[PDB]
Amino acid sequence: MERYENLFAQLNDRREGAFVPFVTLGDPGIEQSLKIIDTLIDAGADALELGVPFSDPLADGPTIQNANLRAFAAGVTPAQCFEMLALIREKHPTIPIGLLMYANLVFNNGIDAFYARCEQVGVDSVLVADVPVEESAPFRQAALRHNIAPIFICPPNADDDLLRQVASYGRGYTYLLSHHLIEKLKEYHAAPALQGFGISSPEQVSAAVRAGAAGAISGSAIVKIIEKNLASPKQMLAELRSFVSAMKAASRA
Amino acid sequence: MERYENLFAQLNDRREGAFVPFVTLGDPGIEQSLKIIDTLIDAGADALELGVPFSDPLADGPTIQNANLRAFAAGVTPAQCFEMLALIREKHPTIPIGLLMYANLVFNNGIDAFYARCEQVGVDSVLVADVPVEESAPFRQAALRHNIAPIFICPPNADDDLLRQVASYGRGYTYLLSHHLIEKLKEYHAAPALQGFGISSPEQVSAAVRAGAAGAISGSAIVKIIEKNLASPKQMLAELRSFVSAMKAASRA
Amino acid sequence: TTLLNPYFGEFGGMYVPQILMPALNQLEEAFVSAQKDPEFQAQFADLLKNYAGRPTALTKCQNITAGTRTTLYLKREDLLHGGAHKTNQVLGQALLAKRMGKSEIIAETGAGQHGVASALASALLGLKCRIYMGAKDVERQSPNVFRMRLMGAEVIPVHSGSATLKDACNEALRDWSGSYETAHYMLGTAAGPHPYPTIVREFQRMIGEETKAQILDKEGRLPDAVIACVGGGSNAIGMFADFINDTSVGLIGVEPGGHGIETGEHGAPLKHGRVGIYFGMKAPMMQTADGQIEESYSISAGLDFPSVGPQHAYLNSIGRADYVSITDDEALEAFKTLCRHEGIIPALESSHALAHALKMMREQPEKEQLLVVNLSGRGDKDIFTVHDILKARGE
Amino acid sequence: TTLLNPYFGEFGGMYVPQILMPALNQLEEAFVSAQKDPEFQAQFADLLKNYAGRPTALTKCQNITAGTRTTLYLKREDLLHGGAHKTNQVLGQALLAKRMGKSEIIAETGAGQHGVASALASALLGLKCRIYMGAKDVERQSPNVFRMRLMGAEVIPVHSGSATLKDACNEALRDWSGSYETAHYMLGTAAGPHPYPTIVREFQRMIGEETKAQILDKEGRLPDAVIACVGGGSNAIGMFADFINDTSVGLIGVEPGGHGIETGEHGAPLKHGRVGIYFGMKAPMMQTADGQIEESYSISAGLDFPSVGPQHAYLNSIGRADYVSITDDEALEAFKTLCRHEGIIPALESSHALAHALKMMREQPEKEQLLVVNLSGRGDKDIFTVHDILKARGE
Ligand SMILES: *Cc1c(COP(=O)(O)O)cnc(C)c1O
Ligand SMILES: *Cc1c(COP(=O)(O)O)cnc(C)c1O
Ligand SMILES: [Cl-]
Ligand SMILES: [Cl-]
Ligand SMILES: [Cl-]
Ligand SMILES: [Cl-]
Ligand SMILES: [Cl-]
Ligand SMILES: [Cl-]
Ligand SMILES: [Cl-]
Ligand SMILES: [Cl-]
Ligand SMILES: [Cl-]
Ligand SMILES: [Cl-]
Ligand SMILES: [Cl-]
Ligand SMILES: [Cl-]
Ligand SMILES: [Cs+]
Ligand SMILES: [Cs+]
Ligand SMILES: [Cs+]
Ligand SMILES: [Cs+]
Ligand SMILES: [Cs+]
Ligand SMILES: [Cs+]
Ligand SMILES: [Cs+]
Ligand SMILES: [Cs+]
Ligand SMILES: [Cs+]
C-alpha cells in the first residue's frame, strides 16, 4: 500500500501538516485502548504511532514507562496487540498506522515473520527504537519485502553521514528529534520529516510545519491525558478529543 | 615470728600432718567469711590459706573464680581484707596465716609497703600465684625483710633446677602440686611440703602424709561447701565444721 | 562505521537508540587510542598495583585435593581492593572517562558490588558518581548502598518496570543519552553494546595474564583448565582471554543453575535461554516465549544477570569454551568446603566456579589435571545468606 | 633461665604461674631455632606471599593532602587475606606450633578479629582450633563467631568475671597449662609474657620492612614519621621495628582516647594508665586505685585492650617513640575522609592512626613532611557502627 504517500500528497494539496499522536496499545486496557484510538482518529489524527508493551523500553521516558506498566498490568501481549491492529485497520482503511517496536519483539519469532504479520494486519511502518541505522539492514529488508516502511530517527546530534543514511534507507516519514536538518533531509530526498521532540501544544505543531517539516508527532502528551484520567474513562475520551482537535487545527493552512 | 616452724615441730612431735583449708576472704560477705574462718579453726585447721579477691585470677579454677565473683558482688576490697586479717590474727595468735595473692595487688602500692602491711596485721606467708621463681626476687626480698615467708609452688612438671630453686628460696612450706618430688625437696632442705593437688577427701589427706608430705592443702573443696550452702549460712557453717574435722582427723597418727 | 568489529560471530552489536551511537563511537575511539598510549597504560598499571594491590596471589589448595590427582589453584581476585575483580575494570573505565574529559560517572548496579566498585574508583579519581539501582535491590542491599554513599556517590533508586538490574540498566542509558558530553557510563560487565564487551575484557585480562605467568613459574606448564563463574561474563573473560590461543587449555564457564535447570529458576541463558536482542546486544537471554525479558534466579545475587556477554556466546558456538551450570546447593557446599579446608571465605558467585572444579576432581579422582579456579571475590557479604539457609535446613 | 632477655628495660617479664614456665621456655626455644632455620623462613614466606598476598600495597593519598606540604602514604594491611595485619603473625605462630609437633591451637578473642585470624590459619595448616571468647563479646560479635565456626573452629563462650577479653585471656591460659604438650596458645598481640611480645613483633616486622623498601623506591628517602594505632601493639611494633635504628624516623603510636582522656572512658594506658603486673607482663594498665584491672573503652572494639605491649612502654620511656591519643569523633572523621576522598573504607582501629596524621597535616599545613600511616585493616566490619552513630547525630 501507499498510505503515507497518499496522506502526504493530500496534505500538500491542502497546504497542511500531519498531526500524529502516539499511544501504547492496550493502555489502560484492550477495550479502552480501542476507544482511545477511534477517538484520536475521529478528532482528526492524520496517522497513528502505536507502541507494543515491552518489558524493557530503553528509549522511553517516564510517561511511556508508566503506560507500558499499565498495559502489562492489564495482561496485554504482542499477540493481542496484533489482534487490535487488525481491528483498527478494518475500521479505518486509509489512515497510516506506524508501530514503535523494540528489537527483541521483532526478532523473537523471526524478523521476516514479524513483518509478515505486520503486513497481514495492515500496518504501514515500523520504527525499531533500539536499532540504529548502522544495524538496520535485516529489519529494513524484511520491512520492504512485506510492504512496510522502515522508519528511522534523525536525532539532534545527527551528522551528514547519518543524514544521508537516514535519507536513503527510511520510507514513509523521517522521525525528527530537533532547520538545517530539515533542509538537508529534503536535499537528500528523504521521507517527509515529522517533528517528534516536545510536541505538547498547538503552537509547537504550527512551529514544526512553519520550520518546513511535514508535520508533528506527539510522543507522550496523549499518554499524559490517559494517565491523568484513569479513574474516569468518559472524561478521558472527552479530553483526548479536544486535545487532538486543537493539535490538528494547528497544522491547518 | 616463727609460726610455721612452731606448727611443724609440734605436729612432728605428734607424728601428725597439717591440714590447711583455703578460702577467699570476704566470700560470701565480710561477716559470714569471718564466721567461716573461725569455724575452720575450731574444727581443727592447722593453718589457713586465704585469697584476696582480684579482677583476673589467672591461676584459679571455676569454684574459685565464683568465690571471687561473690566477694566482689559483696563489695570486698583489699583494704577490707587487711582489716579482716588483723581481726583474725587478734583472735588466734599461733595459727599460721598464709595469703594467696596476685602480683598486681602486691605491686599496686609498692611491693615493700604490701609486705609491711602483711607484717603489721600478722600474716606469716604469701604465695604470689603469677610470679614464677625466676621472677620472684623482689617479692622474696620484701617478704623476708618483713618476716613473711615467700611460698613457692612445686608443679608436677618440676625439674631438678626448679626443685633446687624452690628449696633454696621458699620458707614456711613448699606448695606441692603432684614421691620423687617429696624426697628431692627433703634432700635439698626445702620448707616442709604441703600437698595441694586434689585434696577433697580424708583419704587424700592420709595419702599425702603417708607419701612423706608434711600435710595437705584443700584448695577448693571448702569453697565448694560455701557455694553449695549460700542460701543457708547456718548449714554452711555446720557442713564446714564436719568436713574440716574429718579432714584433720585423717592427718592424725 | 566503527574502528573495531562490534560482533563476535553473530553475537554482540550496538543495539541502542540512534541518539546513543555518537557516545559509543566516542568511547570506542578513546579506548582504541588509550590502548596505544604508554602513558595511559602506565597510569592504569600504577592504579592496579599501588591502589588495588595487583598482582593477586595464586593459592594452591592441597588440603582440598588430598588423595586425588587434581592440583587446584585459586586466582585470588578476592584479595583485590574492594574484595572482587570488578575493581580492575572500573579503574580502567574511570581513566578512560578522564581521557575523554568527563568529570561524571553513571553506573547501574544489582547486588551493589558494581555500584561500590564504581563509587570507589570515582572517589579515587575525583569524578562525581551517580548510581542507578532498582528500588527492590536498594531495599535488600542496605550495606552496599551505605558504602556507596560513604564514598560520596549519589544513589538513585529506580521505581520503573520490575525495579531491578535490567531497569537500572535502562535508566542509566536514559541519563547518558542526555549527559554523555560530561558523563561516562561505567557498564559493570562484559556485555551490553560494543565497545563495552571488548573494553571490559581488555581491562580484566591481567587476571589471565598473571595466572599464566604464575602457573608457568610454579608448575612449568599451562593449566589443563581454567574455570570461572559467569554472571555477565567479565571475570570469566578476564581469566580466559590470554588463554584463548593456547588451544590445549580448557575454558570452562559456570552459570548459576539456581534451584535446578529443570525448575526454570536459574540464571543460565547461554545454555538454557534463547538468543534475543536487548541491553544493546544480540546474545542468549532469559525470556518468555513471546519475547519479554525475564529475571534470572540464583542464591548469588551477583550471578543474577538475565543474559550473558556476546564473546562467551561466540566462544561456546565455536566450541572453544564449554559452559556448565552449578546449583544453589552445589555452590553452598563449595563455600563450606573452602572455609573449612583452606580458611578462605569465597563469594557465593565464585563458589559456583569452585563447585564445578570440585566435581571435576571428585567424579574422576585418578584423572591427572591441573586446574585454576578464578576466585572472583570474597564472601563476607554472603555470611548472612549462608547462615539463614543452614539454620532453615537445621544445620 | 631464658635464651633471650624477657624485659624491655623494666617492662615485660614472664609473670605466669610456675606450671606455665616450661610451655614458655619451650616456645622461646622453638622460636629461636625457627629464626635460624632457612626452611622455616621459606615456608613462612610462602604462606605470606601465596596465601595472604604479601607484599601489600603502599598507596599515596594525594586527594587528602592537596594544598599542603604533607605527602601521605598508607601501608595497605587492609588488603591482606582476612582484611587485617593479624594474619601475618597467626601464620607464623601456626608454623611454630607445627615445628613443636602440636596439632591444636588455643586462642583468645575480643572483637573476634583474632579469633577469625586464628581459625583461618588453623584451617589452612590442618590444626584443631578452639577459641575462648567473652560471652558478652560472643553476643555482640555474631558475624565473627559465624566465620570462626565456618572455618571449623570451636568457639567457647567464657562466663567468668566480666566475661570479656581479659577473662577470655585467662581461660585460654587455664586450658594451655593442662594441654601444652599438644596445643599451642596463639596470643593475639605483642603483649603477654615473654616470648610473645618478641615473637609477635618478629612475625609482623615485614610490615615495616616492606614500607621502608617501598618508600625508598618511591621517594628516595626514609619517611619523616610512621604512624600506627595501638591496641595491644602488634601492628604498630610491626611497622616500627625495622625503623627503630633509623633515628631520623619518628615512631608515633596512637591509643584510643574514647570519649576523651578526661572522661576516663578511653583505652590509653601507656600515657594515662599506671604500670601494673597482669596478663603475664609488667606494663601500663587501665586499673583502679586499689589495683583491680579495668576495661578500656573505644568506639573501636579492636583497640579495647586494657594494657599495652611492653616494648611500646620501653620505647616511650627512652623517648624513641611518641604516643598520642585520638578520640572516637576524631577517628570517625578520619573514617569518613578516607571513604570519600580515596574510596578506601578503613577499620575504625586504623582510622585512629589516620586521624592523627590528618591532625599533623592540618595543624601545620606548610610543614614539609613525608608520613606513612599503617592502615592495619579494612572497615567493612564497622559500617553498622558508623551508620548507627551518624543516624543518632542526625547525619
Ligand atoms: C560481579 C561479580 C561476578 C559476576 O559478574 P561477572 O561480570 O560475570 O564477573 C562474579 N563474582 C563476583 C565476586 C562479582 O563481584
Ligand atoms: C587487632 C587489630 C588492631 C589492634 O591490635 P594491635 O595488636 O595493636 O595491632 C588494630 N587494627 C586492626 C585492623 C586490628 O584488626
Ligand atoms: Cl479497557
Ligand atoms: Cl482511515
Ligand atoms: Cl556476710
Ligand atoms: Cl591460734
Ligand atoms: Cl553480523
Ligand atoms: Cl567530586
Ligand atoms: Cl551531553
Ligand atoms: Cl584440556
Ligand atoms: Cl629486670
Ligand atoms: Cl583438623
Ligand atoms: Cl599437656
Ligand atoms: Cl622526624
Ligand atoms: Cs529468531
Ligand atoms: Cs498554523
Ligand atoms: Cs609501684
Ligand atoms: Cs592417717
Ligand atoms: Cs600483592
Ligand atoms: Cs593432589
Ligand atoms: Cs547469568
Ligand atoms: Cs601534598
Ligand atoms: Cs589499648
B36 near B244, Cβ under 8 Å?
no
In a 3-state reduction of DSSP, which class is residue D132?
Answer: strand
Q: Do chains A and B touch (3 or more CB pairs under 8 A)?
A: no
Query: Of these residues, A42, A49, A119, A159, which one is catalytic?
Result: A49
Residue with cell 564473546: C311
A200 C-alpha to ligand 23 centroid (Å): 69
Best residue among C80, C113, C254 to mutate for probing ligand 1, ranked by most atoms within 8 Å of CB: C113
- Separation in Å, CA C151 to CA C118, D64, D307: 10, 13, 34
> Left (φ > 0), alpha (ψ -120 to 50) or beta: where does A213 sit?
beta
C-alpha gyration radius of chain B: 17
* Residues in chain C whose Cβ is within 8 Å of chain D: 49-53, 56-60, 63, 76, 79-81, 83, 119-124, 126, 143, 146-147, 150-152, 336, 339-345, 380, 383, 386-387
Task: Please give the single-letter amino acid code of residue D218.
Answer: K
Quick check: D160 contacting B, CB < 8 Å? yes
Q: Kindly state the cell numbers that stand for C89.
A: 575494570
Q: Which residues of D touch C344 (CB under 8 A)?
A: 81, 120
d(CA A23, CA D228): 65
d(CA B150, CA D198): 30
In a 3-state reduction of DSSP, which class is residue B204?
Answer: helix
Q: Kindly state the cell numbers that stand for B142.
A: 620484701
Quick check: A133 contacting C, CB < 8 Å? yes
The DSSP H or E segment spanning C316 is helix C310-317
The DSSP H or E segment spanning C132 is strand C128-134
d(CA A123, CA C24): 32
A181 near A212, Cβ under 8 Å?
no
* DSSP per residue, B15-74: T--EEEEEEETTSS-HHHHHHHHHHHHHHT-SSEEEEPP-S--TT--HHHHHHHHHHHHT
Burial grade of D331 (CB within 10 A; 0-12, 13-18, 19 or more): buried
d(CA A145, CA A140): 9
C64 near C358, Cβ under 8 Å?
yes
**Is the backbone peptide bond immediately before B28 cis, with ω within 30 degrees of 0?**
yes
Which among D334, D376, D27, D111 is positioned nearest to D234, based on CA atoms? D376
Q: Kindly state the cell numbers that stand for C231.
A: 554472571
D61 is catalytic: yes
Q: Name the residue ranges covered by the structural domains of chain A.
A: 1-253
Quick check: B197 contacting D, CB < 8 Å? no
Residue C332 backbone dihedrals phi, psi, to 5 degrees: -60, -40
d(CA A72, CA C170): 18
Burial grade of C294 (CB within 10 A; 0-12, 13-18, 19 or more): middle
- Mind spelling out the 3-state secondary structure of B105-149? HHHCCCHHHHHHHHHHHCCCEEEECCCCHHHCHHHHHHHHHCCCE
Q: Kindly state the cell numbers that stand for C137.
A: 535491590
Atom of ligand 2 nearest to the CA of D191: 7
Ligand 2: residues whose CB is within 6 Å?
D 84, 86, 113, 189, 229-236, 302-303, 347, 349-350, 376-377
- Separation in Å, CA D147 to CA A20, C252, C329, D155, D182: 63, 30, 19, 10, 25
* DSSP per residue, chain A: --HHHHHHHHHHHTT--EEEEEEETTSS-HHHHHHHHHHHHHHT-SSEEEEPP-S--TT--HHHHHHHHHHHHTT--HHHHHHHHHHHHHH-SSS-EEEEE-HHHHHTT-HHHHHHHHHHHT--EEEETT--GGG-HHHHHHHHHTT-EEE-EE-TT--HHHHHHHHHH--S-EEE---HHHHHHHHTTPSPEEE-SS--SHHHHHHHHHTT-SEEEESSHHHHHHHHTTT-HHHHHHHHHHHHHHHHHTT--
Please list, in sequence order, all residues whose beta carbon lies within 8 angstroms of the beta carbon of residue D66, skipping any fewer than 6 positions away: none
D63 C-alpha to ligand 8 centroid (Å): 11
d(CA A24, CA C336): 51
Dmax (CA) for chain D in angstroms is: 60
d(CA C48, CA C92): 9
D229 is catalytic: no
- Separation in Å, CA D13 to CA D9, D174, D185, D277, D278: 10, 19, 17, 9, 10
* DSSP per residue, D309-323: -HHHHHHHHTTSSEE
In a 3-state reduction of DSSP, which class is residue D295?
Answer: coil
Ligand nearest to the CA of C104: 8
> Left (φ > 0), alpha (ψ -120 to 50) or beta: where does D107 sit?
beta
Q: What was the structure determination method?
A: X-ray
d(CA D226, CA D80): 19
Q: Kindly state the cell numbers that stand for C278.
A: 536487548
* A65/C160 Cβ within 8 A: yes
* C173/A58 Cβ within 8 A: yes
d(CA D184, CA D102): 6
In a 3-state reduction of DSSP, which class is residue D330?
Answer: helix
d(CA A90, CA D240): 88
The DSSP H or E segment spanning D337 is helix D328-342
* B132/D17 Cβ within 8 A: yes
B79 near D290, Cβ under 8 Å?
yes
Q: Please tell me the distance in Å from C288's CA to the nearest CA on chain A.
A: 10
Minimal Cβ distance to D58: which of C50, C59, C63: C50
The 8-class DSSP code of residue D343 comes to: S
- Dihedral over alpha carbons A135, A139, A140, A146 (to 10 degrees): 170
Atom of ligand 2 nearest to the CA of D200: 7
In order of start, what are the domains of chain D with their CATH numbers? 8-52+86-204 (3.40.50.1100), 53-85+205-390 (3.40.50.1100)
* DSSP per residue, C233-294: SHHHHHHHGGGTT-TTSEEEEEEEEETBGGGTBS--HHHHSEEEEETEEEEEE-B-TTSPBP
C227 near C374, Cβ under 8 Å?
yes
Please list, in sequence order, all residues whose beta carbon lies within 8 angstroms of the beta carbon of residue B148, skipping any fewer than 6 positions away: B115, B118, B119, B123, B124, B125, B126, B142
B164 near B153, Cβ under 8 Å?
no
Which among C148, C57, C311, A109 is positioned nearest to D51, based on CA atoms? C57
Beta strand residue intervals within D203-362, DSSP E = 225-229, 250-258, 274-278, 280-285, 322-327
d(CA A55, CA C161): 7
B172 near B4, Cβ under 8 Å?
yes
